[PDB]
Design a protein around this motif. Structure first.
Motif, short mmCIF file in Angstrom:
data_model
loop_
_atom_site.label_atom_id
_atom_site.label_comp_id
_atom_site.label_asym_id
_atom_site.label_seq_id
_atom_site.Cartn_x
_atom_site.Cartn_y
_atom_site.Cartn_z
N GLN A 71 12.50 30.82 39.14
CA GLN A 71 11.11 30.03 39.71
C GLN A 71 11.50 29.02 38.82
O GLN A 71 12.61 29.12 37.88
CB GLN A 71 10.20 30.04 38.92
CG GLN A 71 9.36 31.89 39.12
CD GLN A 71 7.51 31.97 38.48
OE1 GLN A 71 7.36 31.39 37.88
NE2 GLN A 71 6.84 32.09 38.99
N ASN A 113 16.53 30.92 26.18
CA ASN A 113 15.47 32.47 25.99
C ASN A 113 15.82 33.68 26.85
O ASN A 113 16.04 33.31 28.08
CB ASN A 113 14.67 31.64 25.90
CG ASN A 113 13.75 30.24 25.25
OD1 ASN A 113 14.22 28.97 25.66
ND2 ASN A 113 13.21 30.48 23.98
N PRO B 72 10.33 29.58 20.96
CA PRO B 72 10.11 28.14 21.37
C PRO B 72 11.27 27.51 21.90
O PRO B 72 12.03 27.98 21.87
CB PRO B 72 10.01 27.70 20.36
CG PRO B 72 11.92 28.41 19.20
CD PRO B 72 10.82 30.14 19.74
N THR B 73 11.34 26.81 23.54
CA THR B 73 11.87 26.64 24.46
C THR B 73 12.81 25.35 23.22
O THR B 73 12.16 24.39 23.02
CB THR B 73 11.85 26.04 25.22
OG1 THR B 73 10.62 25.36 25.89
CG2 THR B 73 10.65 27.32 25.81
N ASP B 75 13.29 22.45 24.74
CA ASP B 75 11.62 21.57 25.97
C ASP B 75 10.47 21.54 24.97
O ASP B 75 9.72 20.52 25.30
CB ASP B 75 12.37 21.26 26.96
CG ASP B 75 13.23 20.77 27.67
OD1 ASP B 75 13.93 21.24 28.45
OD2 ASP B 75 13.83 19.52 26.52
N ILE B 79 7.32 30.13 25.41
CA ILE B 79 8.28 31.27 26.36
C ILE B 79 7.20 32.42 26.14
O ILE B 79 7.92 32.90 24.85
CB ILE B 79 9.31 31.38 26.60
CG1 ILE B 79 9.75 32.46 28.23
CG2 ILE B 79 10.21 31.57 24.98
CD1 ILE B 79 9.44 31.74 29.12
N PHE B 100 4.98 34.33 30.67
CA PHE B 100 4.15 32.97 30.68
C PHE B 100 4.89 31.97 29.73
O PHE B 100 5.96 32.35 29.49
CB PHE B 100 2.79 32.46 30.25
CG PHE B 100 2.21 33.78 30.40
CD1 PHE B 100 2.37 35.13 30.26
CD2 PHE B 100 0.73 34.13 31.20
CE1 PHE B 100 1.21 36.24 30.00
CE2 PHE B 100 -0.06 34.67 31.69
CZ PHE B 100 -0.13 35.46 30.88
N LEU B 101 4.69 30.68 30.81
CA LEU B 101 5.60 29.09 30.45
C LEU B 101 4.59 28.59 29.84
O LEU B 101 4.12 28.42 30.41
CB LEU B 101 7.14 29.07 30.78
CG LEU B 101 7.63 28.04 30.47
CD1 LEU B 101 8.56 28.11 29.28
CD2 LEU B 101 8.78 28.04 31.71
N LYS B 103 3.39 24.51 28.18
CA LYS B 103 4.20 22.95 28.06
C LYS B 103 2.91 22.68 27.84
O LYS B 103 1.51 22.72 28.09
CB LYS B 103 4.57 22.45 29.13
CG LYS B 103 5.22 21.74 29.01
CD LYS B 103 6.26 21.01 30.37
CE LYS B 103 6.47 19.45 30.45
NZ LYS B 103 7.65 19.75 28.73
N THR B 112 3.22 26.62 33.66
CA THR B 112 3.61 25.95 34.21
C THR B 112 3.75 26.79 34.88
O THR B 112 4.78 26.74 36.31
CB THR B 112 4.81 24.88 33.89
OG1 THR B 112 6.35 25.57 33.33
CG2 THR B 112 4.56 23.72 33.06
N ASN B 113 4.91 28.24 34.28
CA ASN B 113 5.52 29.04 35.10
C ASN B 113 4.69 31.04 35.07
O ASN B 113 4.98 31.25 33.41
CB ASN B 113 6.52 28.98 34.84
CG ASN B 113 7.59 28.42 35.36
OD1 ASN B 113 8.28 28.19 36.49
ND2 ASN B 113 7.16 27.52 34.58
#
Lengths: 123, 123
Positions: A71, A113, B72-73, B75, B79, B100-101, B103, B112-113
């Motif tokens: 995605q 990640n 943590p990502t 951005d 995650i 799951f992601l 934000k 968001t994902n």
């Protein structure tokens, strides 16, 4: 077919081919802030990740991808979920799932990640 | 302990509490740019997503988490990777993998994902 799917598949393919044949080269697909959680163990930062990946016996392992989902993210990242089984010789070891968050930096796809879990699931 | 783990962990618990009690309330943690891949099927946006989740032919749904990983990502996103079993009414128990992601948008952590996949959890 969609762009995020083409890149996600290509990367996954590239990742497992590197993992099953040249683990030492995996560092090239990570960055300093990358994170890897392997079977519950947290390895934050590329230094930690490269040491872990290079400490795996896996002197013979192979990953077999049963299914993958890709995605695009709001920030143009690619989040991918892979499910399959990792073998030894040809006889099944554990089953597994792995999630990757891919980001394009200085025009190269890198994994920021990486999460891997073993699972007694046949999929 | 780490902030991302506290948050992602907090998000996961809430998500499944809603899912297991009133799927129609899940709109609160999804936004229009949200992507959901459920058993290979893809949906985009809060409305289509809640529509899809609400349409699952189940009255009583109960998720059992056996393991969860958060990172943590680069951005400032979180995650999350979850593994566990799912119980829907009188259906046989089946294991699931879900990513799951998260934000932060408007002082609120949203997904968001989302990617969900079941295991042909025999036995």
């Amino acid at each position: 077919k969609p762009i995020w799917e083409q890149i996600g598949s290509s990367f996954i393919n590239h990742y497992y081919q590197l993992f099953d044949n040249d683990r030492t080269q995996l560092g090239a697909i990570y960055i300093d802030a990358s994170c890897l959680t392997w079977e519950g163990q947290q390895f934050q930062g590329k230094a930690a990740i490269v040491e872990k990946l290079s400490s795996l016996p896996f002197q013979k392992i192979q990953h077999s991808i049963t299914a993958q989902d890709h995605q695009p993210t709001p920030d143009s990242c690619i989040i991918s979920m892979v499910v399959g089984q990792l073998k030894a010789d040809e006889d099944p070891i554990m089953g597994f799932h792995q999630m990757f968050l891919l980001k394009n930096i200085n025009d190269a796809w890198v994994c920021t990640n990486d999460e891997f879990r073993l699972a007694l699931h046949n999929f």
